[PDB]
């Protein structure tokens, strides 16, 4: 029985094969921004409210015109079969099951069509490829299986300097393939606009953390950002989102969903997030450690630890909704 | 002999079982806010005034109707025949002999009435019960038993998420109970009112954090509030009292009285807490640690410890009362 | 040879008890102000100035109406005795041969006459005592015997809680005693009246941290302060003086010299103390370590490095005089 | 294969003599400002940019009239052939080839003519001699020998205390010599002016951090400077000149080039610097970890790690030259 995300992080060192745990794990350069995803949320402190109705404690956000039952979704995460072997349909089965929306990934190692098939509330994540078409005939792919939004990611105009992969020469094993083709362009604004037109499904950018591209997105007709150095993975020496989100939904001013992700460890972190005003949270790599850990059963696990969390986070704090979690007061400290 | 609390803990460490030590030291979650209680206050450095007359030092103030001998009661602390086999009675006999407030529990081991029946100043904590009236019953039996305050609980809509407890297993010996009774409801500002309604004590709301709910307190007709974060134990990643205290002290404009608790370690610590505006602190572990050290005389031996460590640091810091501590200027640093 | 200051503190650990080495280095309390003496200064970078004239670069001063060599002092130390068998005249003969004021102490282990006929600029050191004649008659002695300040500590109520002291059982050797004498009264700003009064040498108020107490010092016709907590042995928690010391020098606009002390443990330091505003510093521990490690030799090399140290920071910082390096900018950093 | 500048650290310690690697990587006093130079780099994070067009990302800058491959010089590091026999040569040589800019000591240990004959873009730095005609006549014949820039060092009145220097009783082999010679005087604005008549190239000045003295360089006809505490090795406690830099950016308000150096070690680094205003920045002790590691190969592999680096440090932070890397916005943060 786990009580913490970090008896699973325990639990997944053990069962993977160093390398994989460090394609996991690792950020780029020296690994600045992915501890300071982790260091900007532990300088959070909330300033809880007392003795407010909790008759009806509810954690459910409405997102792209669905209801989820936390506010939280399943990060995109590529080549899945890399932790257990049901890769992606084992985490969207358990993200179905709990109500969490799960982002099918560009390079799943299980076919989108297969992973939409599954049910739930699939998200599509889109990298921009050399060839445009092909970027136009996924989102129309994802589109067609189902999915109800596009995650388009911003933030790899080609993949940061994972040392750790480079140290350990990382490379797939055979049996993990990208499923859904048979190669990277820098994404513009301009292929933001061609996946807008392409599409009736809202557009959301992730990996912004400027103010004025985040006032850029809600102008593009953007339905969300993701404001995220990309799990410090990215460019190494990024401002961590966390630190970007209150300054963020304050400049979009309602104009688009504004989601957040990088470290979240608790619920806790998840109501630390509402309260500097996101919308919802990404969680990575500790779906990653439960599908590692225990497969299918394993996120099932996860995802209910962390609805136990939130919902115990929120009521402590005098949050009858996520909307009231909205409207909580934070402080910085000293750790 | 202690020459410092910290002497305390070493002792009670050796001769408690691990499980009620951990029940004793624990925290919620990551246990962020347990140490950041201790963060806040190893930050502060207070600016002594010197030259000033000391010739009558007193450390004295009056407080619900009452004088106290030192700023300081004892912080309410359930099931204390967990420490020692006299519990309750022993902590509220040294009390009651070093001129002290107690706080008797509603999850006390020994029942309010025998606990009230050793003197000194006794006064209640309530927590909110599901059964309505049994919370009323309850507030009547410590008030025709001559407790003088009563002390709600506000921050515990249920209990926290101790992880400590969960990995040891932890639960009650068969050899104590909650002595009171023969369950927990959210207390809501309706709940406030009725226990006004009901008693002619000082009601006393223990676990306010945000300066809005201060103000709503002074509103709803409290005698005094804590501001406090349970110690640690309820929402992890909630605010120290210390950090609010400034301003809450401020927003009140001498409405009602202002204690804090939360990490007071020493007479030095008492002072800071002074100097930040608040009437009187609480203490909590310290008082179990010397309980479980030497029983009635080990809280005996702490409550002269801190008695001197509270003159002395008075006095170095050009105090001859506790209003004039009040009037000190503090200086945040780095540790 | 000794490169720096902690050469000394090394060489002194090596020769004396453990409890005498705990009397020096020891504070009050937790040591949390002893440490944060070191913190502070740490914290503080200089703006260094290039391309200035330093065909002369001279660290004199002038203070109290005489020359001195370096912007610095041996601050009053009790019962020197303790570290070497000359004690006090060990260190007021390189003091005097360095060109450096030595302060005698009211708690010599040498009289004061013997002190002051080494020659130099002996400046004395008042406590003030429960018989006040006593206190006067030692301020009239030190006159009479060519003392050229009187330093009153005015943070001494009485002696703060020394941990280390009370765990070691420490107590004087039969062999040292307050040579002085043949009991602690607080100091008021009365006393400091009466001691102006009695004297025409400048009076000195040693331990002032407040800005209103600087202001009052001005007032009652202080010649100096010297902005102190008393090395962290007085109350634990109390600021840093240095910390102070720009507030401090700003509030009195010439009005009396400023000196600082606390932590100085380099040429470096007094430069970061000289730019801050203070008119010199004392140094205390140091000059211990030195007297405990080669008696007079070794405070005559401690003096010399110091005097190298300051020479070299000043010329580095492009100042060529102690006036130029009073108007250097410091910026605070992290460490 | 180095995968960053770490790797040719810890192969340089391995084969360099303890000695001659503390030489190189020590700093004056206590260290302070050399441990601050990183400190301040890593409290700096970049707010990178989106979706903008990296079809030709381009690191050059044109610098003193000529075409850099990087916004980087290789910084003036007396005494070459201390790390390799090949000394400088080796090290002119690789910044020949990778297109950036090396800079020639007057303390080089081969003679300023071998090294200027080695091509590429060769600048010179001047010490101001006691022999001022001796300084002219250096001036003279680095621009005879083609060098594009006089680089003039004046935060060196003298050499600061450098304790491992002196630890160790370190002086230089008698197989390495001033090779420019067959003494230092301090440099004042009237040594600039003397520089400035005597030369039509680009006269930098090196050592500054207060931004008056960088205002005043720009009225002196200064080409550039280059903010800098002098890797640390000078006065100890000087501010990084990371931490002026934005101050002094804004303050010469382009009326000369504003180099940093300091704790460079990455692209990401130099991201950091150009983001926070700098024209470019001089690497010094990577360049020497290559140069002992590998010789003239080292080097190369080097710049080519760092030009990797830098070019993917821009794109991810969506930067298609160096001036759009100068509007980048930054954030402190805490490590
Ligand atoms: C192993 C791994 C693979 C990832 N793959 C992708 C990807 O293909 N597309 C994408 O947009 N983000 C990807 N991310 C980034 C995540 O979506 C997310 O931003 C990050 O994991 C959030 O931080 P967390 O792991 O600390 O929760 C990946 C992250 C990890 C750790
Ligand atoms: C073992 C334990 C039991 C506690 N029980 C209660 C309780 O029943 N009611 C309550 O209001 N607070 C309770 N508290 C919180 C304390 O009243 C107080 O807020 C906290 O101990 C203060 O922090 P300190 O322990 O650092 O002094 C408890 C604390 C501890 C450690
Ligand atoms: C062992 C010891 C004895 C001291 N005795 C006295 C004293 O008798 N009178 C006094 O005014 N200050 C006394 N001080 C304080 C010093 O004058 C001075 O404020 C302190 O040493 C400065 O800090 P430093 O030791 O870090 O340089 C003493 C300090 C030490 C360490
Ligand atoms: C071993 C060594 C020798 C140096 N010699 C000189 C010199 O002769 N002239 C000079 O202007 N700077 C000199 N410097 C300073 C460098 O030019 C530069 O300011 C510093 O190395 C930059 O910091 P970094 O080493 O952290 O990159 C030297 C630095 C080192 C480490
Ligand atoms: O961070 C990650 O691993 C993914 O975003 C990713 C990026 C580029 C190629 C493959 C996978
Ligand atoms: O500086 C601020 O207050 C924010 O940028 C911030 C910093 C660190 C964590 C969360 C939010
Ligand atoms: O913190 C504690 O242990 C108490 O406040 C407490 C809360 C809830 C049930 C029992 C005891
Ligand atoms: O930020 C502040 O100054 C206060 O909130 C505060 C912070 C830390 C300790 C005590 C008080
Ligand atoms: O700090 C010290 O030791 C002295 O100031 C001191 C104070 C009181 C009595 C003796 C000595
Ligand atoms: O806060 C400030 O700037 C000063 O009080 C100060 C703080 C720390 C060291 C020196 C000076
Ligand atoms: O830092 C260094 O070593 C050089 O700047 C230097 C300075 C003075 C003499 C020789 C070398
Ligand atoms: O205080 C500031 O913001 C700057 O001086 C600064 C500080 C630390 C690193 C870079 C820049």
């Known amino acids: 029985t786990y009580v913490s995300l970090a ?28 501890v300071a995803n982790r260091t900007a949320l532990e300088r959070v402190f909330v300033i809880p ?11 459910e956000i409405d997102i792209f015109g669905r209801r989820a039952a936390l506010p ?4 995109p995460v590529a080549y899945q079969r890399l932790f257990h072997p049901e890769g992606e349909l084992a985490v969207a089965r358990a ?3 709990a109500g969490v929306p799960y982002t099918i990934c560009t390079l799943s190692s299980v076919s989108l069509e297969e992973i939409a098939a599954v049910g739930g509330r699939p998200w599509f994540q889109l990298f921009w490829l050399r060839d445009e078409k092909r970027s136009l005939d996924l989102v129309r792919r994802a589109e067609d299986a189902g999915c109800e939004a ?5 933030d790899v105009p080609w993949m940061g300097r994972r040392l750790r992969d480079m140290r350990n020469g990382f490379a797939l094993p055979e049996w993990v393939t990208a499923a859904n083709f048979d190669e990277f362009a820098p994404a513009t604004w301009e292929s933001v606009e061609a996946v807008r037109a392409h599409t009736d499904l809202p557009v959301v950018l992730k990996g912004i953390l400027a103010v004025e591209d985040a006032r850029r997105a809600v102008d593009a007709g953007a339905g969300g950002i993701v404001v995220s150095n990309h799990g410090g993975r990215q460019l190494d020496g990024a401002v961590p989102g966390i630190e970007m ?10 104009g688009c969903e504004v989601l957040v992700d990088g470290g979240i460890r608790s619920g806790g972190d998840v109501l630390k997030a509402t309260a500097l005003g996101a919308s919802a949270v990404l969680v990575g790599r500790p779906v990653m450690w439960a599908l590692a850990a225990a497969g299918q059963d394993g996120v099932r696990q996860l995802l209910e630890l962390l609805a136990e969390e939130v919902r115990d986070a929120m009521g402590l704090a005098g949050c009858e909704s996520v909307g009231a979690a909205r409207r909580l007061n934070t402080k910085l400290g000293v750790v």
């Open 95 to 97: 993200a179905r099951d």
């Open 49 to 59: 409210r007392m003795l407010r109705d909790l008759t009806d404690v509810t954690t």
């Open 72 to 75: 939280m979704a399943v990060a």
């Open 245 to 254: 989100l209150g300054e963020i939904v304050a400049a979009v001013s309602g």
């Open 7 to 34: 008896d699973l992080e325990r639990a997944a060192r053990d069962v993977l094969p160093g390398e994989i745990f460090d394609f996991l794990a690792g950020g780029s350069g020296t690994e600045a921004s992915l």
């Open 150 to 154: 596009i995650v388009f990611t911003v």
